[PDB]
């Protein structure tokens, strides 16, 4: 049910995904820009839920704080996710 994934953010390029909070206050990958960083690395897919970012719980963060945290982060990044299924 829970998966650990990793990706590399070594430039100033955006991740190229959009996030939304749903009714359970869960952080959901809503759209993925084709050709963008996440799309190329295959790290996340639409409907996946992000639980943690580098071991940092998403639950006690606002959407702005998450956006700022992700924009500024660099290097090897680990997500704990709840994957969606086709």
């Amino acid at each position: 049910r829970v998966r650990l994934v990793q990706f590399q953010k070594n430039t100033d390029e955006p991740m190229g995904i959009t996030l939304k909070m749903n009714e359970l206050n869960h952080c959901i990958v809503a759209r993925i820009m084709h050709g963008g960083m996440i799309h190329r690395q295959g790290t996340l897919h639409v409907g996946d839920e992000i639980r943690e970012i580098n071991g940092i719980s998403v639950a006690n963060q606002t959407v702005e704080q998450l956006q700022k945290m992700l924009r500024e982060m660099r290097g090897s990044i680990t997500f704990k996710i709840v994957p969606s299924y086709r």
């Binding site: 955006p14 996030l19 939304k20 959407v63 702005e64 956006q67 992700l70």
Partner: peptide, 5 residues
């Protein structure tokens, strides 16, 4: 609302 990262 949606948020870009």
């Amino acid at each position: 609302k949606e948020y870009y990262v």
